[PDB]
Design a protein around this nucleic acid. Sequence first.
DNA 1: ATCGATGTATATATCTGACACGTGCCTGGAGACTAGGGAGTAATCCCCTTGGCGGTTAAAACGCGGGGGACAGCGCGTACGTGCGTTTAAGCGGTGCTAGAGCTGTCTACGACCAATTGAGCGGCCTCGGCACCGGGATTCTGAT
DNA 2: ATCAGAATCCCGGTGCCGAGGCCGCTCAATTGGTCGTAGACAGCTCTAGCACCGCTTAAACGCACGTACGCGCTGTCCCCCGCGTTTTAACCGCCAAGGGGATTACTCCCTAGTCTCCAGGCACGTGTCAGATATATACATCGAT
Lengths: 95, 93, 97, 97, 102, 78, 83, 103, 105
Amino acid sequence: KTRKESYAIYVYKVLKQVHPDTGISSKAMSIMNSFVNDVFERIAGEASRLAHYNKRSTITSREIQTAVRLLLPGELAKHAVSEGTKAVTKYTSAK
Amino acid sequence: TRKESYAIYVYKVLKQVHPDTGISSKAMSIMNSFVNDVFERIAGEASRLAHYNKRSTITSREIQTAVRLLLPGELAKHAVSEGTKAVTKYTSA
Amino acid sequence: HRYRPGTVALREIRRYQKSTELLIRKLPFQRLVREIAQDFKTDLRFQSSAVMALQEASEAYLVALFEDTNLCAIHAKRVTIMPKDIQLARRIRGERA
Amino acid sequence: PHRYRPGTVALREIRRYQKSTELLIRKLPFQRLVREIAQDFKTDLRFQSSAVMALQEASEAYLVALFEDTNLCAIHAKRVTIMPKDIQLARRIRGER
Amino acid sequence: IDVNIPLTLFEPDNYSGMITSQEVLIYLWDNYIKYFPSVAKIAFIGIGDSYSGIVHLLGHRDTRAVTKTVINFLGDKQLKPLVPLVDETLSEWYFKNSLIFS
Amino acid sequence: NIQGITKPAIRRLARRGGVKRISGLIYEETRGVLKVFLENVIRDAVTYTEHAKRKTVTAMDVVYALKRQGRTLYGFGG
Amino acid sequence: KVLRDNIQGITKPAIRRLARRGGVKRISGLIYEETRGVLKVFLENVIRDAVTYTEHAKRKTVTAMDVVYALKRQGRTLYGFGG
Amino acid sequence: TRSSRAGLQFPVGRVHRLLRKGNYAERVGAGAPVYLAAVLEYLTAEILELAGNAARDNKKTRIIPRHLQLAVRNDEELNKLLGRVTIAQGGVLPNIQSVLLPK
Amino acid sequence: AKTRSSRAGLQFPVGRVHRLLRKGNYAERVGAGAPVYLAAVLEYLTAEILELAGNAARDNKKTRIIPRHLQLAVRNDEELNKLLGRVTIAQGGVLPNIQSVLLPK
DNA sequence: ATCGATGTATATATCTGACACGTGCCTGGAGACTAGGGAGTAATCCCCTTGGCGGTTAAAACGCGGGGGACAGCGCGTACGTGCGTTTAAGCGGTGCTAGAGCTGTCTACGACCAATTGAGCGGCCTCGGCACCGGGATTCTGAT
DNA sequence: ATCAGAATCCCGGTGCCGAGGCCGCTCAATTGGTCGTAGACAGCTCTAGCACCGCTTAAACGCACGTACGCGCTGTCCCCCGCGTTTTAACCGCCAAGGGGATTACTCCCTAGTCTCCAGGCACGTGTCAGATATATACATCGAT
């Protein structure tokens, strides 16, 4: 018995954001869970390498900013700089 | 300061093969980059293995397996053989 | 009436790239995979979705190779193919030397 | 007036350039060039000369790699001569956009 | 081949007899038997003492490229287990084809 | 088996693959390269399973064998 | 302040010599610009990453290490430069 | 929480535990799960928006992964981006050339 | 003899390797003989490379090795040209790979 | 057939800086000891896997005919190698300056770490409707003339 | 243009099965709170990037000639398309059987933690030989008549 975690409800409600009344199969959801894990692994691996490159022990939102403008082509990357620095000020809003 | 390289142990295995041979510093850079490369591929591959197997430390079984997964035939063969030779030679006595 | 070459060829390109569907008789290919799977290991139960993943790998990789083979034929000013198109195609994949 | 048949002493120099290891891009053009490209993102940074030599080695490596692929495309194209369609075919085989 | 072992005196476990059994076992396999090319189907038969030298032929040397199954009439002597050193697969092979009687 | 895959299935994959008229040594060369493909995949998947101390090769292993050379299938055992 | 006509410094005979190391017998006249254009599409895909390293590093000098780290992520890893 | 206070959809506790577990550096500045969650949430909004547009093209109301591969081949940043990754049940698209069409 | 490597007859420092395994965020804890086995594979492949590097400098009559020899030593061995095809050596140099159809006749 | 020029290889001597070594000083490596958690093992479950049966049922096989696709032959058309004289700017090196790299030193913010309570996230549950099934009639080409 | 003949589409009924939803469980998040050190942050030095200049020359450019490689045309022969006829084994539903991993509770050795000790290993200094460079000589091949 395993109550095994995935990215179901979050990608579910992001689909409820961008397309407010639609459906999806479980197979395509498994593709999407795979896709979230893949991008999680590549940004996290570049964060690992850049943290070892900068001779230091920690990784902040700054490091994710420079990691994504190394990763994506710079239009999508700089749109993610907008969503990320949005999230910087909106998580330093509260605790 | 210190500078942790591997140039003298490369000189050791170099002289084990031949006393007749001069490395360059750029060939040492190629060789050290090869060390750091193969270091981190195998080291991340063992970390991948321990992530798949959900443990804390690493047995040399994992190094054996990852050498068989990465390296082709004679390479993985002789490397598994030299590795279990070293497992015997240290871990025995 | 007897059609020229190309008619049901173009019509079946339009038919098979419409459908979302599998194309291969399954158990001949499973006979192929267990004929490989005997070779180095024994007492081998298996799981079915691994065979489905090997199905997706084989069908996607080979419709991709027919696409490369098609574009080497497009380069070759021809419509009927050669195996040497596949040989050049997987050299410039870099999958083959 | 003695005059060679075409391309053969060129192949003698193909044996010359495939007996060697060197760079051929000269240093001040590539220096001015990479200062023009790094100019286009955020201006006036100081560099390493080893950075310039690293980008120059990667440049000539990927060049002579794709020159040998374009030569194999002209061989499969039943030709002695190359075209830009060999290059364009090589980009859509390699998946370049 | 027969090898007698002279015992150790006034002692619970015949220990230096085990020491010279590792000297005998490692010397025979690392001096002449790999240089016997025409060899297959070796069995080791230990009577009483000094099983740990043949345990030391198993867990410290690949003698099982030629030998097949070890025999021990232990009886009253102390247990000499195979330590898992390169793996516990050779100890599992030990656990499948060996004999010890106590 | 080795010839359980037939010529018309290869032509159906050619017609989804955009190929319009087809040669004949193609079919046997295709069966050989497909069997090379499957042998390298099941080589390293069986190597993962012998590390796993299991007697069932999972689709996890097959995705990891794709993950050797950057050919990752989404959806079936990441 | 931008620089100009540096890709004109890549002349037609230099690309011709590198294609002679590339084994090529006969050399078409239709070629030489697109190569250079692909070369532009080469370095546009490089340093779009690379300065994002040293902007993070708060350095006003650019290393070869950033070049090496970029060619790791571009998959064009070369030795002879270390680290 | 740490997540609704941040205003995202992607949970900072989960991601923080997995970055703790995932061995990258020693310590963690806590904007990094938040900024990582922001980029991950924006790119899955990209994929689901183009996938819903490709599902609008074919009107299977549950998205078959045909639509996902259509959403790959529409967006050339995504087609240029995910160029090594396969999709099951994704299908293909027609491409018939001047040498291939009847003259 | 301070070293753990002479206990196994190696040449590469398992204290240093065990240090960078402990201080590298690869795994959480690092075992004893898995770095020994890793240093053994490292020591074998550097002996195997410098074998053929000495061969390629040997037929090219060189001692202080230029990496032309190294490019021959990787690229000729199709276990290792397979395994290390991803990386070009700086000042590598290319092979004579000349097809017959462009050769004269 | 003999002749030439271009490239490759070789023979020489010569000088340099990189390598290769030697020198000396320390920090990280070694040792010794502990404690804790990692890991390893066995006992029951039940789930998952293999296996096999018989009936239709389309797909595979096999065959046939000629056109168009392959291939070869010829002739045309043209651009690129080859050779020489002219021009442009990279390379060389030599001097000087400071920005920023790098090194240092303290303080405190920021993250770790612990404990106590709570809902975020999943399994298990059922039902329903999106979609597969289809039978008929509207059109939309292909090839022949 | 003019034809059938295929191939393609759209509709009403049935029918079914995977999403999707809610139920409830639980364990990791959250919160509350403290502690210490990495790292923030400022100071200092000392590297190396930039610049400039003038002597050299390697590379780039241009022309004249023509040759031999691309390609367009024709013409055929056999390999695919279409279509007719014969055989397999894929699939569904049914039961039967057993392998092994999950889960559970248990213990112990090993690796980490800590401390203290000391030479391995480092930078620094130094001297030298493989290698590059420059000059003389013979050998191969391509090509023109």
